[PDB]
Amino acid sequence: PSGVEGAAFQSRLPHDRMTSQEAACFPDIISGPQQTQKVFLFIRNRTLQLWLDNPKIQLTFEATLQQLEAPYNSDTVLVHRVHSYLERHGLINFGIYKRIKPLPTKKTGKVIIIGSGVSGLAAARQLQSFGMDVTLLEARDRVGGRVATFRKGNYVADLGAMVVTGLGGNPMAVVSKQVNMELAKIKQKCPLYEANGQADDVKVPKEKDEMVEQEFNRLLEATSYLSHQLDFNVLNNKPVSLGQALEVVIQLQEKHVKDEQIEHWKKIVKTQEELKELLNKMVNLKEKIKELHQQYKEASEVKPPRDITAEFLVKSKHRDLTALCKEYDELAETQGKLEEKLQELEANPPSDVYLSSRDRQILDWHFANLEFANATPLSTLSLKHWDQDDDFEFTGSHLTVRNGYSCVPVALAEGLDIKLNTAVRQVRYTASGCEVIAVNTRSTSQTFIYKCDAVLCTLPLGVLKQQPPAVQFVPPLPEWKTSAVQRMGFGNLNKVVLCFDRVFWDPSVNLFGHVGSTTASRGELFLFWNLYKAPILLALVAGEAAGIMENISDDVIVGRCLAILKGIFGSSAVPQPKETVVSRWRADPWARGSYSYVAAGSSGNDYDLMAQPITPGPSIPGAPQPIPRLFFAGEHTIRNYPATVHGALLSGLREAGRIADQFLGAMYTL
Amino acid sequence: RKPPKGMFLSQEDVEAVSANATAATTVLRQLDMELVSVKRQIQNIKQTNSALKEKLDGGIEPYRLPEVIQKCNARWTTEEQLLAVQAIRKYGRDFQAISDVIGNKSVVQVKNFFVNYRRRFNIDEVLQEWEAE
Ligand SMILES: Cc1cc2nc3c(=O)[nH]c(=O)nc-3n(C[C@H](O)[C@H](O)[C@H](O)COP(=O)(O)OP(=O)(O)OC[C@H]3O[C@@H](n4cnc5c(N)ncnc54)[C@H](O)[C@@H]3O)c2cc1C
């Protein structure tokens, strides 16, 4: 889109309609005259446009009204209400921007944020910019959390988040404009390499490559039909998974292949039996013709002069023999026309198999790739909901951060009170306020107490899932919260960093697949990454393989890596790697996995439950309902953008707004 | 909206393959046996038909009688009339066959004969005699 409408789109808002969010804050307008609504919408869109056109500096209310025309600059309270709304909810003035009006002299309220991942950092920046006292407590010795970046010399490889999934409507597009941020596009060309005995691996020909991929897409779309149109969502009181449904679909396609073959061979036999019955008639007719010829010959040998009965016998037997020879030629004509139809039917058989061993192996690569995208085996994904966030995907080509994704959190961390090496052990929340108990990661006997008005919990879902708990809540989280934590899926994927002294692979190819031998290990080093002038190959472990590979030493993994690389690039042209790094996200105690997925039995609704804040019981019994104390951000708390950096970023922005509204009050409804 | 072009997913087959733990491989093996069963049936009836074709070897060429046609004459001879009466006794109302036996009398002339000499050759009796067989 283009213009003020482009700004609405870039902010993930409909340009021509008021959101539920807006309806809440501006109920007068949305219940009121259609005219004023359109006025509101333009003000909203124009302010967004202004912000987006220059996100390097703060956009003040004055500066906004400055660039407004009549009759939009007539009602200045409406302009203020809009600007403040957009400011609170982090649609304007978020990220890293030059401040016009220097921060308030004294701070109001105190907030402890657990974890300095992107969701944490984003909220911290906001809350601080709203004039609150913010301190982040990070267990690690670094910011960014699941945004990790390996560095050596100038060579850089993201062990965590790596891809910016399109700039169209992506809040990261703003951040990237705000900083240096050099983004490099990703060439989506990906050749696949299947084994060839003792010989080098052969690139899969464009013939198969394209037909298997299209079958893969067709299989997915098929499961979607199976889910929505046929309602195949529960089987034996258990929710149907994607992999579960994929099996059923594949099986039904094999059934079809066989059903087509059966009715083809049955079309042959019914003709092969028509021929049988015709050949029998022909044999019997030849027998009567043979006998009738003799009878005629005998009758014809009674030499003239014959009487008329003997004369009749000759003529009669003659006529009868011509009539039976007439009949035989009909049946001889049918015989040829059945034999011709028999070759016709045998020249056009139906499909031999649904998928060959070679096909099903390539298809398993596509499955592994999907298991990589969702960071989980397809047997765990909900059939009905695994793809609920598909509509909200950004436009534009996917990119990578050239100087390493940690570029971003580090830049967000600037000017914030971040206590590194501080592992939160217990969160206490009461009517009077909160205290957070943390220890030093280096010496765990050294204890820290933090008193605050509100706690923002950005602990990964994996952490929240730990049994026994890595963090204790006092009082415990309610059933409705813990159940959501339980039901939600938290997946895994891993990366292997391979540093070589020289680039031995195709330098123009960004990424190439390796086709595994079995379904079981389809995800094991199924894909290799290459980007910059840097000599790093990046091996990806996905699906069921990810979990198992964590229980295997670095050497063996690096071994299996080279084995596959030799098998493609020649058993000699592959040198030993100088530096190797192997991620273990499921083992990492500050992650306990990679990111969330919609598990079978869960839904998008559980993500909303996750974001829901907690309000403690009253201190003195009979005292009024207190303020909400415990707040949740993080990738697992944002329904429409889960399992992503931008989703975390947004979830942070969300909570900062909710906390501010709760502890500073909404100034725009005055 | 509907299954992808060439993808087969009927409500019925879904329930059947999902019915139990190994209903999937049961239905697929059942058709595999069904398939090899029909294949061996073809091999057999192909052999039966191969043998029957060998019995028809030579066709009916030694038994083919040369074509004899003479002009479709108008005059009834005593000789021809008697052939006709016998043909009516053997063939009945098959005006065609009767015409072929006599040789030089058209299918209409035969039909005329049937009504001309109806009294004199007792064609009534002759026709009921044929129906007795
Ligand atoms: C391998 C991998 C690849 C990925 N690739 C992509 C990608 O290509 N594109 C994309 O959009 N997204 C990707 N993601 C997801 C993205 O990294 C996350 O969604 C995002 O970083 C989540 O941010 P968060 O702040 O919610 O969680 P985190 O970044 O994990 O922040 C939580 C923080 O809390 C800290 N913490 C944990 N326990 C404690 C404790 N007891 N006390 C104190 N602190 C604690 C952690 O150390 C962490 O810093 C990937 C994730 C992984 C694992």
Reduce the secondary structure of A404-465 to three states and give it as a string.
CCCHHHHHHHCCCCEECCEEEEEEEEECCEEEEEEEECCCCCCEEEEEECEEEECCCHHHHH
| CA distance linking residue A115 with residue A124, whole number of Å | 10
Secondary structure letter of residue A602 according to DSSP: B
A178 close to A95: Cβ distance less than 8 angstroms: yes
Q: Of A148, A169, A153, A117, which Cα lies nearest the Cα of A8?
A: A169
Largest CA distance in chain A: 148
Q: Are A132 and A368 in contact, with CB atoms under 8 Å apart? A: no
Q: Residue A323's closest CA among B80, B65, B84?
A: B65
**Closest listed residue to residue A533, CA positions, set A494, A562, A574, A502:** A502
Answer whether A71's CB lies under 8 Å from A39's CB.
yes
End-to-end CA distance of chain B: 69
Q: How far apart are CA A498 and CA A515, in angstroms?
A: 19
Q: Which helix (H) or strand (E) holds A121?
A: helix A118-129
Q: CB–CB of A382/A601 below 8 Å?
A: yes
Length of chain A: 670
Contact A153, A378 (CB under 8 A): no
Ligand 1 contact via A610 beta carbon (within 6 Å): no
Give the whole-angstrom CA distance, residue B92 versus residue A316.
13
Q: What is the DSSP track for A390-408?
A: STTPPBS--EEETT-TTHH
Backbone angles phi, psi at A636, to 5 degrees: -85, 5
Any known ligand binding at A162?
A: yes
Q: Report residue A147 as tokens.
A: 């945004």
Please count the helices (runs of H) and the strands (runs of E) in chain B.
6, 0
- A617-A620-A624 Cα angle (round to 5): 65
Please state the domain count of chain B.
Answer: 1
CB atoms within 10 A of CB A442: 9
**Pure H helices in A578-644:** 605-611
Q: What is the DSSP string of A47-83?
A: HHHHHHH-TTB---HHHHHHTPPTTTTT-HHHHHHHH
Rounded Cα–Cα distance for residues A549 and A564 (Å) = 15
Residues A492-530 as b/e (b if ≥16 CB within 10 A, e otherwise) read bbbbbbbbbeeeebeeeebbbbbbbeeeebbbbbbbbbb
C-alpha A245, offset from chain centre: 17
Q: Which of residues 277-306 of A touch B (CB under 8 A)?
A: 279-280, 282-283, 286, 289-290, 292-293, 296
The Cα angle at residue A598 between residues A593 and A599, in degrees rounded to 5: 80
Tokens of A618: 């009253």
DSSP A99: -
Owner of token pair 């560095």: A151
CATH architecture of A1-109: Orthogonal Bundle (1.10)
Helix residue spans in A229-307 (DSSP H) = 242-300
The answer to whether A668 and A81 are in contact (CB under 8 A) is yes
Q: CATH 1.10.287.80 region(s) of chain A?
A: 240-355
* β-strand partners of A57: A98
Could you report how far apart the first and last alpha carbons of chain A are, in Å? 35
Asked whether the bond before A475 is cis by omega within 30 degrees of 0, the reply is yes
Contact B18 A328 (CB under 8 A): no
Identify the closest residue of chain A to B11 by CA–CA distance. Answer: A230
Using alpha carbons only, give the angle A284, A286, A291 rounded to the nearest 5 degrees: 95
For an interface test with B, give the residue of A316, A320, A328, A343 to mutate (most B CBs within 10 A): A316
B21 touches chain A (CB under 8 A): no
CA B3 to chain centre: 46
A635 ligand 1 Cβ < 6 A: yes
A31 is written with which tokens?
Answer: 């219940």
Distance from chain centroid for Cα A475: 36
Spatial distance between the Cα atoms of A436 and A432, rounded to a whole number of angstroms: 14
Could you tell me the two tokens for A410?
């580090």
Q: Distance of alpha carbon B1 from its chain centroid, rounded? A: 50
For ligand 1, whether the C-beta of A457 sits within 6 Å is no
d(CA A9, CA A16): 10
Give the resolution value in Å: 3.1
Task: State how far Cα A623 lies from the chain centre.
Answer: 47
A534 phi and psi angles, rounded to 5 deg: -70, 140
Bond from prior residue into A460 cis (ω within 30 degrees of 0): no
Any idea what the Cα angle at residue A402 is, between residues A397 and A405, rounded to 5°?
Answer: 90
> What is the CA angle A31-A32-A35, rounded to 5?
130
d(C-alpha B60, C-alpha A439), whole Å? 108
* Structure token pair of residue A300: 């014809």
A380, B13, A254, A350: CA torsion to nearest 10: -150
In chain A, CATH 1.10.10.10 covers: 1-109
Quote the DSSP letter at residue A179.
S
| A295's tokens | 């009878």
Distance from CA of A389 to the nearest CA of B (A): 20
Q: Which CATH number is B47's domain given?
A: 1.20.58.1880
Quick count: other Cβ atoms within 10 Å of Cβ A263? Answer: 12
**Is some CB atom of chain B closer than 8 A to the CB atom of A309?**
yes
Q: Which two tokens stand for residue A273?
A: 């039996």
Q: Return the structure tokens found at A276.
A: 């049988």
Instruction: State how far the alpha carbon of A463 is from the alpha carbons of A1, A437, A590, A610, A653, in Å.
Output: 40, 16, 7, 14, 22
**Ligand 1 pocket check for A644: Cβ under 6 Å:** yes
**What H or E segment, with its residue span, contains residue B49?**
helix B23-55
DSSP classification of residue A42: H
Count the Cβ atoms, other than its own, within 10 Å of residue A653: 24
Tokens of A593: 């996995």
How many Cα neighbours within 13 Å face the side chain of A585? 29
Buried b (16+ CB within 10 A) or exposed e, A308-327: beebbbbbbbbbbbeebbee
Site from B1, B8, B83, B98 to mutate, A interface, most A CB atoms within 10 angstroms: B8
The CA-atom distances, in angstroms, between A353 and each of A348, A359, A587 are 15, 10, 42
Distance (Å, whole) CA A520 – CA A296: 80
Q: Please choose, from the candidates A552, A585, A595, A523, the residue with its C-alpha nearest in 3D space to the C-alpha of residue A377.
A: A523
Q: Which CATH architecture has domain A240-355?
A: Orthogonal Bundle (1.10)
Torsion, CA A478, CA A233, CA A245, CA A388, rounded to 10: -60
Containing structural domain, residue B47? 1-133
Please state, in angstroms and rounded to a whole number, the distance separating the CA atoms of residues A591 and A436. 20
Q: Would you call B45 an interface residue with chain A, using a CB distance cutoff of 8 Å?
A: yes
CA atoms within 13 A on the CB side of A593: 25
Q: Which residue has the tokens 């894909």?
A: A527
The vertex-A167 CA angle with A24 and A83, nearest 5°, equals: 30
Distances (CA, A) of A336 to A215, A333, A346: 42, 5, 15
The amino acid present at B132, given as its one-letter code, is A
SS3 category, A13: coil
Burial class (CB in 10 A: 0-12, 13-18, 19+), A117: buried
Decide: A547 in ligand 1 pocket, CB within 6 A. no
Shortest alpha-carbon distance between residue A270 and chain B (Å): 10
Ligand 1 pocket residue status of A471, Cβ below 6 Å: yes
Q: Which two tokens stand for residue A21?
A: 């969010």
Burial class (CB in 10 A: 0-12, 13-18, 19+), A89: buried
* CB-based contacts of A270, cutoff 8 Å, min separation 6: none
Cα gap A460→A590, rounded to integer Å: 7
Sequence-distant (≥ 6) Cβ neighbours of residue A648 within 8 angstroms: A117, A118, A119, A122, A458, A633, A634, A635, A638
Cβ atoms within 10 Å, residue B15: 12
Q: How many CA atoms lie within 13 A of A586 on its CB side?
A: 20
Q: Is A378 helix (H, G, I), strand (E, B) or coil?
A: coil
Answer yes or no: are the C-beta atoms of A312 and B86 closer than 8 Å. Answer: yes
Q: Phi and psi (nearest 5°) for A318?
A: -70, -50
C-beta atoms surrounding B95 within 10 Å: 19
> How many residues are recorded in chain B?
133
Question: In angstroms, what CA-CA distances link A466 with A445, A551, A590, A642?
Answer: 22, 19, 11, 20
Q: How distant is the alpha carbon of residue A25 from its chain centre?
A: 33
Q: Which chain B residues are Cβ-neighbours of A262 within 8 angstroms?
A: 31, 34-35, 38
Residue type present at position B40 = R
